[PDB]
Amino acid sequence: MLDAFSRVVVNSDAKAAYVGGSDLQALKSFIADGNKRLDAVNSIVSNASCMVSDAVSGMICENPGLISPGGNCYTNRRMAACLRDGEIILRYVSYALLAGDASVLEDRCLNGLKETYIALGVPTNSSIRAVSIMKAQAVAFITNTATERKMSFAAGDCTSLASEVASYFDRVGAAIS
Amino acid sequence: MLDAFSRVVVNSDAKAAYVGGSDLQALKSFIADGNKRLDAVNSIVSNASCMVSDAVSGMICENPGLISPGGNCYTNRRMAACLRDGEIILRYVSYALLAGDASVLEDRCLNGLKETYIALGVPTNSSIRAVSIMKAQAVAFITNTATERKMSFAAGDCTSLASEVASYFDRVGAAIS
Amino acid sequence: VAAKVGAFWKPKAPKEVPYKRPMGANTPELPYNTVPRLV
Amino acid sequence: AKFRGSVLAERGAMITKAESATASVITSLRDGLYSGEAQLLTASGQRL
Amino acid sequence: SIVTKSIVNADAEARYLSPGELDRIKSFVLSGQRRLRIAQTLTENRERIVKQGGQQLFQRRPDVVSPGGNAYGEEMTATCLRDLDYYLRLVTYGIIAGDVTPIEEIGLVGVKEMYSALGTPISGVAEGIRCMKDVACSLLSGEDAAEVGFYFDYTLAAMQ
Amino acid sequence: MKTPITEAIATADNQGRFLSNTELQAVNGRYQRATASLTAAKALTGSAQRLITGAAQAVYNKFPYTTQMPGPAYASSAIGKAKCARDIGYYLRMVTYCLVVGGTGPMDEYLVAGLEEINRSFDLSPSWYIEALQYIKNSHGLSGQVANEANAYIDYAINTLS
Amino acid sequence: MKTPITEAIATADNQGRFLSNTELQAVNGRYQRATASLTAAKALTGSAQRLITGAAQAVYNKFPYTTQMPGPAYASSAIGKAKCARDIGYYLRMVTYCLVVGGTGPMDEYLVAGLEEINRSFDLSPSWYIEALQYIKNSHGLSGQVANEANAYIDYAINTLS
Amino acid sequence: MKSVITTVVSAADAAGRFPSNSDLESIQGNIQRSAARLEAAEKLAGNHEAVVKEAGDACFAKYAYLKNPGEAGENQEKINKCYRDVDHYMRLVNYCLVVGGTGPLDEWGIAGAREVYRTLNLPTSAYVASIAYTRDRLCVPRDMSAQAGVEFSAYLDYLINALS
Amino acid sequence: MKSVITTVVSAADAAGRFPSNSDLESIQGNIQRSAARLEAAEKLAGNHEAVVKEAGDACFAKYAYLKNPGEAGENQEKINKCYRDVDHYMRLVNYCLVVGGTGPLDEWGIAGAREVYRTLNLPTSAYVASIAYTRDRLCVPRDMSAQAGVEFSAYLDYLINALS
Amino acid sequence: MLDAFAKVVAQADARGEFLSNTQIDALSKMVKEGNQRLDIVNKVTSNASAIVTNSARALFAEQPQLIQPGGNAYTSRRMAACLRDMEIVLRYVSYAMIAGDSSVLDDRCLNGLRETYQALGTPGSSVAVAIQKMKDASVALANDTTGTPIGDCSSLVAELAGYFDRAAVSVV
Numbered sequence A, B: 001m002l003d004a005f006s007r008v009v010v011n012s013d014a015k016a017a018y019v020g021g022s023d024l025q026a027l028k029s030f031i032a033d034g035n036k037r038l039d040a041v042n043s044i045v046s047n048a049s050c051m052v053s054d055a056v057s058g059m060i061c062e063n064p065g066l067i068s069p070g071g072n073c074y075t076n077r078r079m080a081a082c083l084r085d086g087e088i089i090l091r092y093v094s095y096a097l098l099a100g101d102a103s104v105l106e107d108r109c110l111n112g113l114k115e116t117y118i119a120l121g122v123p124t125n126s127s128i129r130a131v132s133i134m135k136a137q138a139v140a141f142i143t144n145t146a147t148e149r150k151m152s153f154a155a156g157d158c159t160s161l162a163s164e165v166a167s168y169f170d171r172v173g174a175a176i177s
Numbered sequence C: 001v002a003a004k005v006g007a008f009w010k011p012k013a014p015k016e017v018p019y020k021r022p023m024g025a026n027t028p029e030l031p032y033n034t035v036p037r038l039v
Numbered sequence D: 001a002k003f004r005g006s007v008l009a010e011r012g013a014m015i016t017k018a019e020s021a022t023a024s025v026i027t028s029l030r031d032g033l034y035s036g037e038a039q040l041l042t043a044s045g046q047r048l
Numbered sequence E: 001s002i003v004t005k006s007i008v009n010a011d012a013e014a015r016y017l018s019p020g021e022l023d024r025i026k027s028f029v030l031s032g033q034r035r036l037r038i039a040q041t042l043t044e045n046r047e048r049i050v051k052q053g054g055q056q057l058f059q060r061r062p063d064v065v066s067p068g069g070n071a072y073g074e075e076m077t078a079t080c081l082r083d084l085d086y087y088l089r090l091v092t093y094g095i096i097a098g099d100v101t102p103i104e105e106i107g108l109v110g111v112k113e114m115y116s117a118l119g120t121p122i123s124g125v126a127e128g129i130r131c132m133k134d135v136a137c138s139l140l141s142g143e144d145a146a147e148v149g150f151y152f153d154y155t156l157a158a159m160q
Numbered sequence F, G: 001m002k003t004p005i006t007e008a009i010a011t012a013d014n015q016g017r018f019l020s021n022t023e024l025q026a027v028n029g030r031y032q033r034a035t036a037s038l039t040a041a042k043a044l045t046g047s048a049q050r051l052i053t054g055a056a057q058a059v060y061n062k063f064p065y066t067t068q069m070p071g072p073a074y075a076s077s078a079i080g081k082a083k084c085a086r087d088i089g090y091y092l093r094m095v096t097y098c099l100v101v102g103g104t105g106p107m108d109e110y111l112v113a114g115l116e117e118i119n120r121s122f123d124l125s126p127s128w129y130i131e132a133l134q135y136i137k138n139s140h141g142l143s144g145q146v147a148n149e150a151n152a153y154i155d156y157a158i159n160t161l162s
Numbered sequence H, I: 001m002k003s004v005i006t007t008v009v010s011a012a013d014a015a016g017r018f019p020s021n022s023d024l025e026s027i028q029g030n031i032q033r034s035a036a037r038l039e040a041a042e043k044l045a046g047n048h049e050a051v052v053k054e055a056g057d058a059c060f061a062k063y064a065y066l067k068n069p070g071e072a073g074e075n076q077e078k079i080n081k082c083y084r085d086v087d088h089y090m091r092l093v094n095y096c097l098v099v100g101g102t103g104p105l106d107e108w109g110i111a112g113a114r115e116v117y118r119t120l121n122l123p124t125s126a127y128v129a130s131i132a133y134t135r136d137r138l139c140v141p142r143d144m145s146a147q148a149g150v151e152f153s154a155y156l157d158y159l160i161n162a163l164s
Numbered sequence J: 001m002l003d004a005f006a007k008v009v010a011q012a013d014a015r016g017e018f019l020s021n022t023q024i025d026a027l028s029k030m031v032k033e034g035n036q037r038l039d040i041v042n043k044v045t046s047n048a049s050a051i052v053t054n055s056a057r058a059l060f061a062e063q064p065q066l067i068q069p070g071g072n073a074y075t076s077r078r079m080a081a082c083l084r085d086m087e088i089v090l091r092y093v094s095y096a097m098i099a100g101d102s103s104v105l106d107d108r109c110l111n112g113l114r115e116t117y118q119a120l121g122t123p124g125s126s127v128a129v130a131i132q133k134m135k136d137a138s139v140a141l142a143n144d145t146t147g148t149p150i151g152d153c154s155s156l157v158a159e160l161a162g163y164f165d166r167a168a169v170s171v172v
């Protein structure tokens, strides 16, 4: 893994340059606006468990064939494992938001996950539907436009932060595809 | 029938494999939240009469065609029939929640239920609504989120069991759909 | 002669697991822009 | 018959023990034991 | 010998022989007569047993008598048959003793070292002993053959 | 070592190219020829001591002067007979190696390379070994392609001796 | 000419020896491999003008600039399209010759010997012919060892182009 | 199958009533006994081949008559069938150690065992000899804990009683 | 690389849990320490050729015998090889401020360096003399903030103790 | 240069003794695979340029220092030598795979490669990383059906990976 600070090192090591100027310009903003990123990851970790539960129930109330016998969500072990998997993906995308960088999201979960789900016979499009539901819940929690749930923040706009997790969830949804 | 411990031996018997320490911790986790499942089943069966009488009356008061003559819940005998026709459903979902998997209601209650209601002339989409109200009441009860009566519990999470009883309740929806 | 090693009373499992699963918290973290020479 | 009845169990146990030892030495032969150079220096190690 | 082994195992504990050990000694001295009969039958049919075992060995392991094999040539084949005769004699000793002490104290302790120093494959000796076991059990009754192969099996296990 | 495998590799390496279908067909010929050659190797292994003794006796019967003339080159004494049986066993071992290997690779490496040097210095007639190999060809007791494959490695040695 | 026959003869002549069993097994592999290759040659002969037209169309669809850019090297005019179809027919003919012959003997003699000289002077990219050969491999419609044998001569040409 | 939970749900179902307080009370007994039986299950599982080999070795030592011609063990493949036959029983009580009841034993090895072994001339005495030899070779320092050996031996002698 | 955020996240993955509200405080304290650490680093980046230039000749003024024939500063090419090597270490130090730890120094500039310098017969005292001149040329007025100088001098001291 | 059939004969002449029947059914079983082994080498030689170019591209997207000016992968000739050094090891791994024995691999490919790379200043660990990336793509490409009968090939791809690891530890 690399955070945003490490990544301007390893892209300017590869150039043999000194870090400074325009790439230190973006490190300046991290040490500026990290309070917004902190309210962001707090708005994820205080809501995470309801997020994966609502996501898998939305997937099941869209497609009942997984809960039918012969489905992948049928029985005691499989649906608990699916809850576990969705929460793990949620945990990694929350880290990738907190780092401002998607390297560990590749290296620790997205590396070789699609072939694993093919080898287990896991249907892909249902999990794509699930992570899109998590993406909608994440941007709803980040715009503070949760119709059911309220936290108080210092006033201001967090559009860039909201945009960042959409790129990350699309990275997950494309890497599983 | 089959419980959660007996679900993994019929999976391992298909490959002539010994159940070993690679899949035993999913069982030990299931044992670790034994008291959570146990208090949840108790919270379901404690207030079960209002659970049934509220759900059938809520199914009535949205579709008042059943009370009209020619309705399936018209006369006094058929209303006495319908009040137990869903109490049996709740009685078997309480079995499936305790046993840990949906095998005890699948061949005992759900096997043959579709053509019974077809041959009798029971409106299936009304019974869909009647069991969805029961699902909503169940997730209200075992999360201790009922605004109508509160029960005392030890603090912690119970959503893993709340998705379980949700996945039991659309199996009753899918089987007469 | 008559070497009974292991479970001689049966043939053995078909030996197939041709998939890679994401290592969580256990991927061997190596250094960037370099090669671990020796150790 | 009375004499065989007593010795059957111990005879079977000793045979089981012998073949246990043999299988153990076969696998530690295959797994690198007895091929370190401290073993290959002695002449009984060379015979093995 | 069963009597000897019972006496030592009781001697280490500094006690007389318990009634179980005496029971077993009694049962042994009572069966000594059929033990001697079985030893008779195996003893005086030694030529056919060694010959037919040598055949089954040489047909199962042609390499040992192939050109250059350990038992290659007239003298080496004679020496191998000599070894098979040694082991048949030891089996008769063990049958009369009622226990593998004679077989194990003579011919089993350090057999791997000896045969490795001689350049002989121990698996070939095991094959020869198995062939002799089949040939010898062919000449006995059911219960007698069962009791007699009891010692060939121990000799094979020790010779792995 | 001349196998059908190694010559295919040597032809691919001479062009410095990958293994074409030519080499794969040359290897496949070895594979569906091997089933009879492995039977020939088993059968020549099983009948070995008998064939060596019979071949030595046939050489002594054809050339009786080898058991009578004094000198180190002849089998007049006991060590001479032992070395004669050792040489016949060497020939049979090379024939079996060429059978299991699938070509005249072992015996080209072990027997005929520098063979007549020995027969010229140690004064040994190759006709003796020809007479032994003719007995082995006549008396192995094989049938079909097993016989066709064992005989084909026997007369290669005969052709090199002549 | 690289056949399984001529390489066996070349290995026997290099030692200056007669044909051993090694060479006979190498020839026998050709003989019980030939039955599927002759079917592959018949089938690629039958589907020829369809496959050539489809391969040219697939190259034009993958690289649309070849039909638009002016110049002699491109198929923007009619003679350029005629020469492109002629080249694809040349490749298919060499593949069929290697199929019936039993090795990469014809196309080593006729196609790849001095091939990049032409592509460098005439300025024709090898990726076009790679794209044509991938279509021919995907669209010949064969099954089993017929497909395994035709594809194995197709990707040899692909490997030499890359 | 025949587990602890599947009696208390079938009794409440045959009575046609909700899971009552005593039904809630019997699942608590799993929480105290699973810690003893699951560790017995995987020390059985990680040492099963060796256990099976010992069991196979025991009956032929006791009954060497069945290696005669015309018997249950004629050639080597029938002895392999015998080792497979007893490895199945060792797998089934591993299954009953994890379930909590004797559910996987009954309909998988026990129900129907009386006819096959009578019709295919297989002596049950040689089965129970190999099972009983595995039973009495249990001890507290080496094999397992104090409470693992208890019901590990109890699932064994249940099979011993059912085969006889 | 051990880094600003990355040390916490990787410790909160090894315990397999979501970031703790303790673990958003170490992130917050590491972000506030890196304000100073970036300040010094951009001064190093915007002005590096002058300080490398004035630090390189400080070595040759101390060790004038390197310019002798047969020594490691004999040519003109061996001179600006040394001036390149000093700039490499200043670029690696400029990383460790923007990196926030001794990562790039340990990996790309210290590992195996002593054996290479011994093989080429370069005196490591010469490589530490230029850095030791660079450290005490610093002034907390007019060069950078006083909070910057302690981190800058700390990484310089790490490099001096690693080389020597 | 030996094949796997040659190896048991070269150990049989040494003791001066005939192959016993257990070596013979060890060899007939091996032969009885036969078609699988050549299916494996057919799959690797059909895609050799793709394996080599994708492994080199992953190597330089990973380690950019070799193509950096001054790197060992610098200059039109050094890249051309690096491109087909990997193709040499791929060729000799396929030779050893069709032979059933790593005798041609040790003798002409790995013999003296280490001090060859030392005398040039070539970093042997990066060569080993390139060998590992060719190995991963070769075992990935080896176990697909692609119009072959279904079966298990596991004991053959283990040997194929073992040849690659033998090449990788000997270079560095």
Ligand SMILES: *CC[C@H]1/C(=C/c2[nH]c(/C=C3N=C(/C=C4\NC(=O)C(CC)=C4C)C(C)=C\3CCC(=O)O)c(CCC(=O)O)c2C)NC(=O)[C@@H]1C
Pocket: J066, J072, J073, J077, J078, J079, J081, J082, J083, J085, J086, J088, J108, J109, J110, J113, J116, J120, J122, J123, J126, J127, J130
């Ligand atoms: C991925 C490329 C890696 C790399 C390759 C590299 N090699 C060289 C130079 C040579 N390599 C050899 C190797 C062989 N010669 C042989 O005959 C065989 C068959 C067994 C092998 C493996 C030789 C002789 C040379 C020197 C000749 C030359 O190439 O001009 C070079 C640089 C060329 C040079 O040193 O001038 C490279 C770049 N090095 C890497 O960085 C990669 C890890």
Ligand SMILES: C=CC1=C(C)[C@@H](Cc2[nH]c(/C=C3N=C(/C=C4\NC(=O)[C@H](C)[C@H]4CC)C(C)=C\3CCC(=O)O)c(CCC(=O)O)c2C)NC1=O
Pocket: A047, A050, A051, A054, A055, A057, A058, A059, A060, A061, A062, A132, A133, A136, A137, A140, A141, A145, A146, A147, A148, A149
């Ligand atoms: C028939 C099955 C079925 C369900 C189970 C739910 C599941 C569900 N929830 C949301 C949508 C959402 N889900 C949440 C999550 C939560 N809201 C909170 O306040 C809690 C803290 C947390 C757990 C309950 C949020 C915040 C939204 C966005 C706002 C909203 O639409 O309510 C969406 C829309 C996502 C999208 O596609 O854009 C769906 C399908 N809806 C369904 O149709």
Ligand SMILES: C=CC1=C(C)[C@@H](Cc2[nH]c(/C=C3N=C(/C=C4\NC(=O)[C@H](C)[C@H]4CC)C(C)=C\3CCC(=O)O)c(CCC(=O)O)c2C)NC1=O
Pocket: A056, A066, A072, A073, A077, A078, A079, A081, A082, A083, A085, A086, A088, A089, A108, A109, A113, A116, A120, A122, A123, A126, A127, A130, C021, C022, C023, C024, C025
């Ligand atoms: C580091 C990151 C990381 C992950 C994301 C998971 C990924 C993952 N999931 C599963 C395993 C599984 N994953 C699922 C999940 C699902 N099946 C579905 O139908 C749904 C789409 C989805 C849940 C919403 C199921 C049901 C299994 C079990 C399949 C089985 O029973 O064999 C496995 C195999 C091991 C196992 O069986 O437990 C792995 C590696 N593990 C990791 O280490």
Ligand SMILES: C=CC1=C(C)[C@@H](Cc2[nH]c(/C=C3N=C(/C=C4\NC(=O)[C@H](C)[C@H]4CC)C(C)=C\3CCC(=O)O)c(CCC(=O)O)c2C)NC1=O
Pocket: A032, A033, A034, A035, A036, A037, A038, A039, A040, A042, A142, A143, A144, A153, A154, A155, A156, A157, A158, A161, I024, I025, I028
């Ligand atoms: C360690 C835990 C930790 C946190 C959780 C944050 C908490 C936090 N947030 C802000 C401060 C802020 N936080 C936000 C963020 C938002 N405001 C909104 O209305 C949006 C919903 C959301 C966008 C994602 C904004 C806009 C400010 C004010 C400007 C700023 O300081 O970034 C501040 C400084 C001013 C204040 O005290 O309020 C602090 C301490 N910081 C921390 O140190």
Ligand SMILES: C=CC1=C(C)[C@@H](Cc2[nH]c(/C=C3N=C(/C=C4\NC(=O)[C@H](C)[C@H]4CC)C(C)=C\3CCC(=O)O)c(CCC(=O)O)c2C)NC1=O
Pocket: B056, B066, B072, B073, B078, B079, B081, B082, B083, B085, B086, B088, B089, B108, B109, B113, B116, B120, B122, B123, B126, B127, B130
């Ligand atoms: C073991 C599982 C089990 C069950 C689930 C029930 C299922 C069931 N329900 C009914 C029978 C019935 N079930 C209903 C129920 C309804 N009709 C409606 O309009 C509503 C949608 C719904 C009530 C909420 C009615 C009204 C009848 C009687 C039909 C009539 O005679 O008018 C019958 C026929 C027997 C009888 O009529 O006495 C059966 C078998 N019984 C079981 O033994």
Ligand SMILES: C=CC1=C(C)[C@@H](Cc2[nH]c(/C=C3N=C(/C=C4\NC(=O)[C@H](C)[C@H]4CC)C(C)=C\3CCC(=O)O)c(CCC(=O)O)c2C)NC1=O
Pocket: B047, B050, B051, B054, B055, B057, B058, B059, B060, B061, B062, B132, B133, B136, B137, B140, B141, B145, B146, B147, B148, B149
């Ligand atoms: C049209 C006519 C009409 C009715 C008859 C009532 C019936 C009714 N109740 C609930 C909804 C509910 N009903 C209950 C039931 C109970 N709560 C308790 O504490 C008691 C033990 C028990 C009955 C006395 C619970 C727990 C909920 C969940 C919502 C909540 O907690 O308030 C719902 C919504 C179901 C859903 O959300 O999908 C409806 C329609 N409401 C109506 O609109």
Ligand SMILES: C=CC1=C(C)[C@@H](Cc2[nH]c(/C=C3N=C(/C=C4\NC(=O)[C@H](C)[C@H]4CC)C(C)=C\3CCC(=O)O)c(CCC(=O)O)c2C)NC1=O
Pocket: B032, B033, B034, B035, B036, B037, B038, B039, B040, B042, B142, B143, B144, B153, B154, B155, B156, B157, B158, B161, H021, H024, H025
């Ligand atoms: C005779 C009937 C009877 C029962 C069935 C059990 C119920 C019971 N529950 C808990 C204990 C608990 N029970 C819960 C469950 C919950 N807490 C919530 O906030 C949710 C509403 C609900 C989840 C559905 C939790 C979270 C604990 C503490 C952690 C745990 O032991 O699981 C414990 C103690 C175990 C412990 O905490 O160490 C017991 C004995 N007791 C009885 O006497």
Ligand SMILES: C=CC1=C(C)[C@@H](Cc2[nH]c(/C=C3N=C(/C=C4\NC(=O)[C@H](C)[C@H]4CC)C(C)=C\3CCC(=O)O)c(CCC(=O)O)c2C)NC1=O
Pocket: H056, H059, H066, H072, H073, H078, H079, H081, H082, H083, H084, H085, H086, H088, H089, H108, H109, H116, H120, H122, H123, H126, H127, H130
């Ligand atoms: C799921 C549980 C399960 C089992 C317990 C076994 C039970 C079992 N064993 C055998 C079959 C057998 N079982 C034995 C075993 C023995 N005979 C002896 O000499 C000894 C007494 C004993 C071994 C110690 C033998 C030898 C056969 C083969 C008998 C025959 O084929 O004639 C068969 C007939 C099918 C077959 O041939 O395999 C069955 C059902 N199989 C199962 O599927």
Ligand SMILES: C=CC1=C(C)[C@@H](Cc2[nH]c(/C=C3N=C(/C=C4\NC(=O)[C@H](C)[C@H]4CC)C(C)=C\3CCC(=O)O)c(CCC(=O)O)c2C)NC1=O
Pocket: D017, D020, H043, H044, H047, H050, H051, H054, H136, H137, H138, H139, H140, H141, H142, H143
């Ligand atoms: C899970 C079930 C299980 C078993 C029953 C045993 C079965 C077993 N026991 C022994 C081996 C042994 N078993 C014992 C017996 C005992 N040892 C003591 O310290 C006690 C006094 C007594 C408990 C009964 C002894 C003394 C040996 C060594 C000598 C011998 O082989 O008999 C061996 C030979 C090698 C070994 O030790 O593993 C095996 C396979 N192993 C298992 O995995």
Ligand SMILES: C=CC1=C(C)[C@@H](Cc2[nH]c(/C=C3N=C(/C=C4\NC(=O)[C@H](C)[C@H]4CC)C(C)=C\3CCC(=O)O)c(CCC(=O)O)c2C)NC1=O
Pocket: I040, I043, I044, I047, I050, I051, I054, I134, I137, I138, I139, I140, I141, I143, I144
């Ligand atoms: C981070 C930025 C950084 C630097 C700019 C340099 C340090 C540095 N110092 C000076 C130059 C100087 N530096 C000092 C500073 C001091 N001398 C004292 O007497 C005091 C003890 C101490 C701090 C007050 C003085 C007095 C000069 C002389 C003024 C001048 O030459 O311009 C110069 C330019 C003139 C020259 O090269 O000669 C440079 C490049 N090192 C660094 O790491």
Ligand SMILES: C=CC1=C(C)[C@@H](Cc2[nH]c(/C=C3N=C(/C=C4\NC(=O)[C@H](C)[C@H]4CC)C(C)=C\3CCC(=O)O)c(CCC(=O)O)c2C)NC1=O
Pocket: F024, F025, F028, G033, G145, J034, J035, J036, J037, J038, J039, J040, J142, J143, J144, J145, J148, J149, J150, J151, J152, J153, J156
């Ligand atoms: C030019 C060289 C050349 C060849 C290699 C073969 C190619 C080939 N292989 C097989 C036959 C086979 N090929 C495979 C191989 C595989 N199956 C899989 O699923 C894996 C992906 C792959 C393992 C690497 C297997 C497993 C068989 C035999 C089927 C079996 O044994 O059950 C057959 C069928 C005839 C037979 O079974 O013998 C043929 C013609 N023929 C040739 O002329």
Ligand SMILES: CCC1=C(C)/C(=C/C2=NC(=C\c3[nH]c(/C=C4\NC(=O)[C@H](C)[C@H]4CC)c(C)c3CCC(=O)O)/C(CCC(=O)O)=C2C)NC1=O
Pocket: F056, F059, F066, F072, F073, F074, F075, F076, F079, F080, F081, F083, F084, F085, F087, F088, F090, F110, F111, F118, F122, F124, F128
């Ligand atoms: C690699 C395979 C191989 C072959 C082929 C071989 C032949 C061989 N035979 C030899 C001698 C001999 N060979 C014979 C054999 C015979 N002479 C007779 O009269 C008989 C007719 C005939 C036996 C059939 C005799 C008697 C000697 C001893 C000659 C001497 O020492 O002068 C010698 C001289 C070295 C020695 O004294 O052993 C060689 C090298 N050696 C080998 O290692």
Ligand SMILES: CCC1=C(C)/C(=C/C2=NC(=C\c3[nH]c(/C=C4\NC(=O)[C@H](C)[C@H]4CC)c(C)c3CCC(=O)O)/C(CCC(=O)O)=C2C)NC1=O
Pocket: G056, G059, G066, G072, G073, G074, G075, G076, G079, G080, G081, G083, G084, G085, G087, G088, G090, G110, G111, G118, G122, G124, G128
């Ligand atoms: C032995 C087998 C054989 C091959 C392989 C072969 C190739 C070949 N193609 C040529 C030209 C050509 N080849 C093409 C083909 C193409 N250009 C495109 O833009 C298309 C994408 C593609 C068609 C698919 C064209 C357009 C020319 C004419 C180029 C020119 O004249 O400058 C020429 C130049 C001589 C000539 O004008 O004909 C040769 C030698 N010739 C042979 O005899």
